[PDB]
Design an enzyme around this catalytic site. Structure first.
Site, PDB file in Angstrom:
ATOM      1  N   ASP B 139      50.878  51.366  31.213  1.00 45.31           N
ATOM      2  CA  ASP B 139      51.308  50.928  32.538  1.00 45.31           C
ATOM      3  C   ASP B 139      51.149  49.420  32.679  1.00 45.31           C
ATOM      4  OD1 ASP B 139      52.334  51.044  35.080  1.00 45.31           O
ATOM      5  OD2 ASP B 139      50.478  51.741  36.019  1.00 45.31           O
ATOM      6  N   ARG B 143      51.826  44.061  38.636  1.00 50.45           N
ATOM      7  CA  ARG B 143      50.769  44.518  39.531  1.00 50.45           C
ATOM      8  C   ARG B 143      49.443  44.721  38.809  1.00 50.45           C
ATOM      9  NH1 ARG B 143      54.399  48.580  38.842  1.00 50.45           N
ATOM     10  NH2 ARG B 143      53.682  50.265  37.460  1.00 50.45           N
ATOM     11  N   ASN B 144      49.466  44.912  37.488  1.00 51.51           N
ATOM     12  CA  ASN B 144      48.265  45.154  36.701  1.00 51.51           C
ATOM     13  C   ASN B 144      47.810  43.920  35.926  1.00 51.51           C
ATOM     14  OD1 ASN B 144      47.680  47.895  37.355  1.00 51.51           O
ATOM     15  ND2 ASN B 144      49.351  48.570  36.014  1.00 51.51           N
ATOM     16  N   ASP B 157      43.350  47.668  33.697  1.00 53.39           N
ATOM     17  CA  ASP B 157      43.687  49.078  33.900  1.00 53.39           C
ATOM     18  C   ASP B 157      44.371  49.711  32.692  1.00 53.39           C
ATOM     19  OD1 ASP B 157      42.566  48.757  36.357  1.00 53.39           O
ATOM     20  OD2 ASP B 157      44.297  49.469  37.508  1.00 53.39           O
TER      21      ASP B 157
HETATM   22  C1  LIG Z   1      45.804  46.557  39.633  1.00 54.12           C
HETATM   23  S1  LIG Z   1      45.075  46.317  41.279  1.00 54.12           S
HETATM   24  C2  LIG Z   1      43.363  45.783  41.033  1.00 54.12           C
HETATM   25  N1  LIG Z   1      42.396  46.529  40.490  1.00 54.12           N
HETATM   26  C3  LIG Z   1      41.283  45.831  40.473  1.00 54.12           C
HETATM   27  C4  LIG Z   1      39.999  46.419  39.885  1.00 54.12           C
HETATM   28  C5  LIG Z   1      38.753  46.425  40.489  1.00 54.12           C
HETATM   29  C6  LIG Z   1      37.682  47.016  39.820  1.00 54.12           C
HETATM   30  C7  LIG Z   1      37.851  47.607  38.570  1.00 54.12           C
HETATM   31  C8  LIG Z   1      39.109  47.606  37.993  1.00 54.12           C
HETATM   32  N2  LIG Z   1      39.443  48.165  36.698  1.00 54.12           N
HETATM   33  C9  LIG Z   1      38.835  47.631  35.492  1.00 54.12           C
HETATM   34  O1  LIG Z   1      38.045  46.756  35.560  1.00 54.12           O
HETATM   35  C10 LIG Z   1      39.246  48.187  34.130  1.00 54.12           C
HETATM   36  C11 LIG Z   1      39.953  49.379  34.017  1.00 54.12           C
HETATM   37  C12 LIG Z   1      40.324  49.832  32.761  1.00 54.12           C
HETATM   38  O2  LIG Z   1      41.022  51.039  32.624  1.00 54.12           O
HETATM   39  C13 LIG Z   1      40.005  49.094  31.631  1.00 54.12           C
HETATM   40  C14 LIG Z   1      39.313  47.902  31.750  1.00 54.12           C
HETATM   41  C15 LIG Z   1      38.941  47.447  33.005  1.00 54.12           C
HETATM   42  F1  LIG Z   1      38.260  46.270  33.139  1.00 54.12           F
HETATM   43  C16 LIG Z   1      40.161  47.013  38.652  1.00 54.12           C
HETATM   44  C17 LIG Z   1      41.565  44.597  41.005  1.00 54.12           C
HETATM   45  C18 LIG Z   1      40.654  43.388  41.217  1.00 54.12           C
HETATM   46  C19 LIG Z   1      39.603  43.080  40.364  1.00 54.12           C
HETATM   47  C20 LIG Z   1      38.839  41.952  40.620  1.00 54.12           C
HETATM   48  N3  LIG Z   1      39.098  41.171  41.653  1.00 54.12           N
HETATM   49  C21 LIG Z   1      40.090  41.414  42.488  1.00 54.12           C
HETATM   50  N4  LIG Z   1      40.310  40.491  43.598  1.00 54.12           N
HETATM   51  C22 LIG Z   1      41.255  40.676  44.693  1.00 54.12           C
HETATM   52  C23 LIG Z   1      41.354  39.597  45.772  1.00 54.12           C
HETATM   53  O3  LIG Z   1      41.949  41.631  44.781  1.00 54.12           O
HETATM   54  C24 LIG Z   1      40.893  42.526  42.278  1.00 54.12           C
HETATM   55  N5  LIG Z   1      42.832  44.595  41.342  1.00 54.12           N
HETATM   56 CL   LIG Z   2      45.333  51.209  40.956  1.00 52.44          CL
END
Ligand SMILES: CSc1nc(-c2cccc(NC(=O)c3cc(O)ccc3F)c2)c(-c2ccnc(NC(C)=O)c2)[nH]1
Ligand SMILES: [Cl-]
Ligand SMILES: CSc1nc(-c2cccc(NC(=O)c3cc(O)ccc3F)c2)c(-c2ccnc(NC(C)=O)c2)[nH]1
Lengths: 314, 302
Positions: B139, B143-144, B157
């Site tokens: 994916d 957006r990711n 992700d």
């Molecule tokens: C696509 S939308 C989104 N998700 C996330 C998010 C948050 C927490 C965890 C994860 N997941 C992973 O870290 C993970 C997943 C796996 O499978 C493999 C490895 C990994 F590291 C994602 C964000 C994000 C992250 C930090 N700061 C922001 N700040 C603002 C202002 O939005 C947003 N944004």
């Molecule tokens: Cl998501």
């Protein structure tokens, strides 16, 4: 020039008071990059006025030197704003100063931590000496905690840049660190790397006593008098004589008889390998340094710069 | 994988404070981590995952989180922590800029050519690392891709789609017809991701039903050439959308091509007017405050 960013009032704002000190007031601030909508948290120190009529140019000249230091245990000046007041900007560290930390964890700080802090502080001072920079106000209050395993020295050169009015050197608890100063600095305003070694010794005494005030109750006006008669800070209860002797050599009258920062690094790191032989602390064992898992967590979140690894035990 | 790279958090040492966004995989929160025996609260980002289609075993969830925590690359998000209760919560570093899709949309009129080409360089660098570790994203999309600084983006992700169990307009045809997911099918979505950036966040095949994309690709129709793209840029995008997966470009060749174009960005992107890459002063200010990890230097103009 490429190391120091000149800020304008329009791109940063003070949003919380953090504390006041001998050099100014510390704020938690927010920086907004131009054209963006995000607010980056920063730390802002608004300095008191200087005793000299310093022009902006050379204020900027000392700020360029403050922004040029590159060492894991020395704070780099990131930005400056010259408005009515002079405002220094650096990265926000949520733990604060080391003096407050040892005061908040007095019954919970182990030997491995205390000895490693002394190593890192000496590593920072040795770098400042290599840069031929003399701090003039080394103390536990001027040690900032990035993580419990990573401390950094700040506010070097601020004493010389801002200066102190003549009445403070003969007043009680003023903007002059009389109880941290070498005797030659009290008597003749002589500041060298070797008087920094003196203040380093008092700083180590601060850590080993978990933040006790040096010469508490003794008037600052009598400090040069008691030092001339051979009186020094007492041996902290947790310090073996090996540790206490190091502190006493930094307080020798002959500045050249005091240890060098590069020899203080060697001695304290040897002690960090076998910490319980040099510091006797109750329940010292269950006060470990963090696991590989948790430090990897601490580092990834808060401390993405590289440092030496903390000295491990035998 | 060293289990020492994944920290298992408990509910009492972390708490959500504000919703940041939602996705097909869960809801994103801004959080504060409170270390035990510490009076500090460290800002973190928390993703609480939605219910999985088919309910996986707790060992498997923990086994894949160890792999997510094992990536070490400046353009791949490393999973820092996890909390396994009734729900699965993923913890990573908090990035105030958010996602690249929203960033490119908010700067629709401000983005310079050097940012767009360098973003493509960095995304291909992150994907090439994932290919080297033989991890399939499944994916990849704008957006990711998360923005640490405007000069530094990271992929997030990866593997969540397979763990949780549909971006039709980002998928290769072999993924639509037979659910075949390879590094090659990731290359297809990389092309769509680049098309997203070059159109400043436009929706691909907007107005076209997802149920008809499989037919539109089979008749040879592809996403149109973005108005700012020279044909050198567009030919790269079309080569990732070839039906034969073995004929698509490889991530190592996308790094070289986009890095060559980034050295003369205005010779490959024709933009009316935007903003160039930051000064050395503003670059080190961004990095000393916000971005201290090791990266290669961003490709500058010759
Ligand atoms: C696509 S939308 C989104 N998700 C996330 C998010 C948050 C927490 C965890 C994860 N997941 C992973 O870290 C993970 C997943 C796996 O499978 C493999 C490895 C990994 F590291 C994602 C964000 C994000 C992250 C930090 N700061 C922001 N700040 C603002 C202002 O939005 C947003 N944004
Ligand atoms: Cl998501
Ligand atoms: C105890 S006093 C204190 N001052 C500061 C401070 C703040 C801003 C700038 C500076 N200094 C310099 O910029 C500078 C000065 C020079 O002369 C040499 C080189 C330099 F870099 C210092 C802090 C501080 C800093 C960051 N975060 C915290 N967090 C909390 C919770 O308090 C506090 N604390």
């Amino acid at each position: 020039q490429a190391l120091l960013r000149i800020l304008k009032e329009t791109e940063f704002k003070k949003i919380k008071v953090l504390g006041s000190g001998a050099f100014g007031t510390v704020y938690k601030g927010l920086w907004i990059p131009e054209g963006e909508k995000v607010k980056i948290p920063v730390a802002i120190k608004e300095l008191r006025e200087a005793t000299s009529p310093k022009a902006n140019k050379e204020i900027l000249d000392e700020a360029y030197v403050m922004a040029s230091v590159d060492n894991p245990h020395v704070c780099r000046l990131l930005g400056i704003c010259l408005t009515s007041t002079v405002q220094l900007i650096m990265q926000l560290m949520p733990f604060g100063c080391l003096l407050d930390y040892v005061r908040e964890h007095k019954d919970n700080i182990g030997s491995q931590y205390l000895l490693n802090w002394c190593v890192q502080i000496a590593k920072g001072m040795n770098y400042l000496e290599d840069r031929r920079l003399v701090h003039r106000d080394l103390a536990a209050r001027n040690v900032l905690v990035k993580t419990p395993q990573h401390v950094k020295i700040t506010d070097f050169g601020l004493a010389k840049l801002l200066g102190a009015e003549e009445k403070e050197y003969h007043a009680e608890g003023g903007k002059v660190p009389i109880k941290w100063m070498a005797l030659e600095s009290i008597l003749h305003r002589i500041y060298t790397h070797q008087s920094d070694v003196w203040s380093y010794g008092v700083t180590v005494w601060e850590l080993m006593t978990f933040g006790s005030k040096p010469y508490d109750g003794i008037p600052a006006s009598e400090i040069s008098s008691i030092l001339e008669k051979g009186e020094r800070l007492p041996q902290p209860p947790i310090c073996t004589i090996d540790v206490y002797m190091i502190m006493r050599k930094c307080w020798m009258i002959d500045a050249d008889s005091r240890p060098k920062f590069r020899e203080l690094i060697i001695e304290f790191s040897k002690m960090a390998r076998d910490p319980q032989r040099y510091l006797v602390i109750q329940g010292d064992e269950r006060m470990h340094l963090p696991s590989p898992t948790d430090s990897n967590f601490y580092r990834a979140l808060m401390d993405e710069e590289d440092m030496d690894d903390v000295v491990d035990a035998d």
